[PDB]
Design a protein around this nucleic acid. Structure first.
Lengths: 201, 181
DNA sequence: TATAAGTATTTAAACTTTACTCT
DNA sequence: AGAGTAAAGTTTAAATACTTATAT
């Protein structure tokens, strides 16, 4: 009572934000943007109905999407105190309400290609061929509706075979945070529609 | 000007709230409905599934109901009938004739051409597109208040309108926006 | 209290996940 | 390794009613 209940809830939310950024090794500018969005959600009364954990986790993801920091939602879900379903609802909800449009939140496939390729130790030759396949899939109308990470995983997979630096469907799936079946579904589709020839597997 | 000659809709689900105007003892009612499920612990009403009109009914002690699954207001009127019938058949009296209100309809449809959702989401106002969570663009119309899900195949789902006439108003608005450039 | 959200029910779209089987 | 699959889960809206957490 020298601190309103708002203030104590903000301190709790800021501790949760600090815990997430330290754990994900997120840069200061991202953490600051997450905090700014969170305060906006509070100002607009957008917390009512959902957990502070839920909302702060969504503000960190929204901040990564606004600043083009290629983190996947799952990395956050892994350390957030709530599930993907719940963080996804809070995230779509506060994005809608803070006017974070599809355009403002868009992150090019290329940025994920580089991020995932880093974790996979793949060369710039592979990155290039994958970016090339993603550009062709987009021109042909095969990308809409599909999980973007699923497409990146499958283009890296295909390109790793084609450039002799093979990685397994399971490996790419693990770093892109989707299932192997998804990588497999996109792989098949990309190979036959773009007529891609592959050594072996 | 936008040729809409290929756009079509099909009703898929109709939802109505009904006031029977009479209290009800849900335990005594459980019989009137063969296929029934009740657990006040989880949900306060009786979940009943009619067979003729293939509709699901939710009966509450307050005498009010919800009818969903219907493909026509007619199927709902019939469902409210069979039930009212079976009720008098165990000693229930109604202060008025049943009051039925269509609360929501869901339509599926096809626009007849494909779309690149990334491009659509760039200029379509009142929309969301998050392919990592759901495949379609989510378009929110203020009036008539409804939501349209637009997929890359050009198929659509319209929910929240209270009539086909209104759903078509929502779709006409979407079509008009999809035409700006 | 007055607010929201969750619990249950329906229904299509089309995508991913789950949980395996069979090579 | 990875091909492949069926069924379940994800989203949209609404009314019913009964609970639980919290804004003020």
């Amino acid at each position: 009572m020298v601190s309103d209940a708002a203030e104590r809830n903000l301190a709790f939310a800021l501790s949760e934000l600090d815990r997430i950024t330290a754990q994900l090794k997120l840069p200061r500018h991202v953490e600051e943007e997450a905090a700014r969005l969170y305060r906006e959600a509070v100002r607009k009364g957008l917390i009512r109905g959902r957990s502070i954990e839920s909302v702060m986790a969504a503000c960190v993801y929204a901040a990564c999407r606004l600043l083009k920091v290629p983190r996947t939602l799952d990395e956050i879900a892994d350390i957030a105190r709530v599930d993907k379903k719940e963080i996804g609802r809070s995230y779509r909800f506060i994005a809608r309400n803070l006017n974070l449009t599809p355009k403002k939140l868009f992150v090019k496939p290329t940025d994920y290609v580089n991020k995932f390729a880093d974790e996979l130790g793949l060369s710039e030759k592979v990155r290039r061929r994958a970016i090339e396949i993603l550009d062709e899939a987009y021109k042909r109308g095969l990308t809409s509706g599909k999980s973007p990470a699923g497409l990146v995983a499958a283009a890296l997979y295909i390109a790793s075979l084609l450039e002799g630096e093979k990685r397994t469907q399971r490996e790419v799936a693990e770093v892109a945070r989707v299932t192997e079946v998804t990588v497999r579904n996109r792989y098949k589709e990309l190979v036959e529609k773009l007529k891609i020839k592959v050594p072996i597997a | 000007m936008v040729d809409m000659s290929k756009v079509k809709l099909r009703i898929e689900n109709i939802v109505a709230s009904v006031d029977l105007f009479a209290q009800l003892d849900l335990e005594k009612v459980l019989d009137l409905c063969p296929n029934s499920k009740y657990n006040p612990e989880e949900f306060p009403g009786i979940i009943c599934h009619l067979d003729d009109p293939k509709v699901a009914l939710l009966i509450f002690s307050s005498g009010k109901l919800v009818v969903t699954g219907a493909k026509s207001v007619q199927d709902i009127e019939r469902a409210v009938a069979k039930l009212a019938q079976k009720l008098k058949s165990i000693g229930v009296k109604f202060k008025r004739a049943p009051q039925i209100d269509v609360q929501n309809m869901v339509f599926s449809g096809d626009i007849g051409r494909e779309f690149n959702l990334d491009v659509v989401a760039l200029t379509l106002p009142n929309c969301e597109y998050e392919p990592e969570q759901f495949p379609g663009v989510i378009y929110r119309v203020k009036e008539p208040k409804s939501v349209i899900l637009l997929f890359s195949s050009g198929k659509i789902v319209c929910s929240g309108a209270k009539s086909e006439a209104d759903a078509w108003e929502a779709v006409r608005k979407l079509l008009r926006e999809l035409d700006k450039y």
